[PDB]
């Protein structure tokens, strides 16, 4: 069995690639996005426990061993996963294949396969071994499908356009090969006998042929543009729609730019499928027709032209890898410089304050020098490639003219025939050049296709649920939690065994120490996530049995870190609910005290706002959030004062709103400050992911629990 290495599509997924690589090595090909979901790859990174759990889930018998400096012991079956350190900067996971006498074979998912000297690797690695072995439950299979053929589906409806492009290209080629015989007719016939009338006619004939050729080129160029855009739009929009349908777990796992890189990826995959469809259709025939014509003209000169193509092929194929290696190394060194410049600019207050203007400059200079060195090495490789292609092309041209003249002198072919042959090389070399210059595009394309298709194969949020919505129409009732444990990924559980009881139409407060566990307990109640151990009952009915649509439509969640999308204030206020009458919006708007700042706007309701409400102050912003919430007319209203200032000008307006609710609807407040919640009915204290004590303020203070100590620590 040959060594297999899985490449990193994202930056954070290191261990996922290693487990996938070993999984492939033993003969089980699985989608890397699914293994990413299994291992629980957070934005921080992958825990070895996460890898062991994911392995144990696949049926691999595996254990996490502390690295021993003596790893030369025979009975340590490979392949094994050992976490190295990349140049004393970040922790990294790498796959060990075979520890030889002194050389260690390591199929680094960051960069292909590499072999280190025992002493070197032993200096690099932390040492944290994960030993895996298949134990009956493991079964060989192929669960990934070829996504390149899946994305070919969008070429099915555009058959006419493809065929029209193919005919246009074919007829362009035919007029090209026909038009290239002008010099022959010129030198052999017309100039020899000195015919004028014929020359004047033939000149116009070839001129008209060329005018029809450039017209077909123009028509083809328009159709290939339209086809390209159409497939590009189709793929981009198909991907975007699928992402939105995925659960919050997907969005917690990955970063923002990590998701949008897929759009640029989508732009690159389209190019490859379009190129593959056209090039193969119009060049594999064009090259053959050209080659046949040349082989008919003269054998010797054709076999010289074949050698020119062969040598060009070899030079490009041998130079293809180092250029991509240098390119990657430049993009790394450039990314560090731009990161350093942003970091240096963001905190100039500090640099100025410490008078460190010299050191930061010296640091930046060293990072520029590094980029220049990397740039120069890539430049040198391009110059070397350019020069050698230059040599081949030029000597090819001269030696063909030499051999041609020799064959003409010997009386094998006529004079003009050589110039016609020299003309036809344009229609023989160009196709095969274009055909050879496609392999790097296809390789980076298949990468992109897999990178994108793996995300398109993920199970949407709607499909993960089965409901019984006709059985319970209303929400309104007592909300309770039973043994509700929760963990974000495969790390320490945020919430352990929890028991709650929220009676209908009472302002219940959840206070605590950890903001994460507090905000998590809200985000859980809406059923964004699902707790592994325990369950949550609304009105004596499991949330898992209620409609997702109704749940999210009937529950309002007011976070202090509110988001505002760039639009019109009026439209922005009632987003997601169209056919809403202004008469409601203005009634709701009053409750938040929108008007007061809304009237000072140029347009009352149609004022345009800056990205993330840049022109809007925090105090006004939240009122837009409350106005959004109260418009919903929900059964549960979940407030948040988490990661807040609490200026005490908004608290009055929150009280004005909470009084303004005027229904038997439940209000859940999550404010760390005890001064705000004293008036609430039941105050629940979240301590280390456990509800310790519950009840009214007076009772909790009277009992003298943890709440008493916190309240005495307050004032």
């Amino acid at each position: 069995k040959k060594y297999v290495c899985v490449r990193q599509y994202d930056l954070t997924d290191a261990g996922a690639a290693c487990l996938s690589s070993i999984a492939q090595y033993y003969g089980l090909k699985m989608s890397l996005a699914k293994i990413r979901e299994m291992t629980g790859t957070d934005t921080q990174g992958t825990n070895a426990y996460g890898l062991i759990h994911a392995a144990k889930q696949l049926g691999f018998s595996a254990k996490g061993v502390k690295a021993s400096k003596e790893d030369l012991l025979k009975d340590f079956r490979l392949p094994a996963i050992a976490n190295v350190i990349v140049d004393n900067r970040l922790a990294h996971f790498v796959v060990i294949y075979s520890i030889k006498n002194r050389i260690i074979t390591v199929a680094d998912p960051g960069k292909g396969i590499v072999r280190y000297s025992m002493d070197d690797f032993c200096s690099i690695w932390t040492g944290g071994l994960v030993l895996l072995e298949p134990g009956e439950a493991f079964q060989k299979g192929d669960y990934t499908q070829n996504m390149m053929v899946k994305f070919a589906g969008f070429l099915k409806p555009l058959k006419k356009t493809v065929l029209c492009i193919f005919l246009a290209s074919l007829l362009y080629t035919a007029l090209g090969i026909a038009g290239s015989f002008y010099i022959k007719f010129l030198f052999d016939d017309l100039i020899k006998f000195e015919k004028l009338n014929d020359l004047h006619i033939i000149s116009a004939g070839f001129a008209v042929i060329f005018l029809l050729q450039i017209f077909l080129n123009y028509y083809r160029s328009i159709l290939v543009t339209k086809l390209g855009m159409s497939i590009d739009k189709s793929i981009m929009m198909e991907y975007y729609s699928h992402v939105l349908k995925l659960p919050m777990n997907f969005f917690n796992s990955r970063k923002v730019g990590e998701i949008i890189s897929r759009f640029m990826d989508a732009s690159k995959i389209r190019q490859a499928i379009s190129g593959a469809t056209l090039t193969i259709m119009i060049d594999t025939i064009m090259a053959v027709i050209g080659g046949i014509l040349l082989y008919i003209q003269n054998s010797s000169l054709f076999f010289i032209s074949f050698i020119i193509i062969l040598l060009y092929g070899i030079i490009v194929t041998v130079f293809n890898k180092p250029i991509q290696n240098a390119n990657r190394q430049i993009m790394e060194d450039n990314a560090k410089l731009t990161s350093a410049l942003v970091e240096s600019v963001k905190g100039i207050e500090t640099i100025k304050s410490f008078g460190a203007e010299e050191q930061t400059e010296k640091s930046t200079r060293d990072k520029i020098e590094t980029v220049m060195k990397s740039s120069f090495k890539e430049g040198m490789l391009y110059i070397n490639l350019s020069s050698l292609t230059g040599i081949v092309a030029g000597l090819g041209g001269i030696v063909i003219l030499w051999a041609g003249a020799y064959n003409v002198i010997k009386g094998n072919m006529s004079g003009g025939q050589l110039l016609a042959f020299n003309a036809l090389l344009a229609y023989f070399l160009t196709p095969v050049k274009n055909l050879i210059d496609l392999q790097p595009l296809i390789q980076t394309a298949v990468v992109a296709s897999n990178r994108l298709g793996e995300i398109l194969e993920l199970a949407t949020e709607k499909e993960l649920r089965e409901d019984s919505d006709d059985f319970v129409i209303s929400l309104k009732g007592d909300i309770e939690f039973r043994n509700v444990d929760f963990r974000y990924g495969l790390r320490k559980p945020v919430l352990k065994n929890i028991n709650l009881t929220i009676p209908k139409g009472k302002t219940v407060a959840i206070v605590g120490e950890s903001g994460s566990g507090k905000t998590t307990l809200a985000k859980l109640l809406m059923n964004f996530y699902s707790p592994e151990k325990g369950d949550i009952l609304i009105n004596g009915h499991s949330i898992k049995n209620i409609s997702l649509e109704l749940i999210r439509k009937k529950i309002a969640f007011v976070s202090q870190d509110v988001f505002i999308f760039s639009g019109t204030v009026k439209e922005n206020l009632c987003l997601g609910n169209e056919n809403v009458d202004m008469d409601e919006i203005i009634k709701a708007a009053k409750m938040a005290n929108a008007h007061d700042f809304i009237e000072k706007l140029p347009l009352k309701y149609d004022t345009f706002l800056n990205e993330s409400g840049a022109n809007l102050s925090e105090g006004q912003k939240q009122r837009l959030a409350i106005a959004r919430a109260l418009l919903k007319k929900p059964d549960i209203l979940i407030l948040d004062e988490a990661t807040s200032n609490l200026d005490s000008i908004t608290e009055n307006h929150i009280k004005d709103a909470i009084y303004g609710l005027e229904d038997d609807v439940t209000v859940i407040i999550i404010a760390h400050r005890l001064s705000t919640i004293v008036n609430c009915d039941k105050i629940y204290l979240l301590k280390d992911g456990e509800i310790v004590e519950s009840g009214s303020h007076t009772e909790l203070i009277a009992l003298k629990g943890c709440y008493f100590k916190m309240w005495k620590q307050t004032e």
Partner: peptide, 23 residues
Amino acid sequence: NIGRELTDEELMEMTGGSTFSIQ
């Protein structure tokens, strides 16, 4: 096996590596 074994916490302590890229 024949190696120094670790607890489930120390497995949770070991972390994976990011890398730099275009943005």
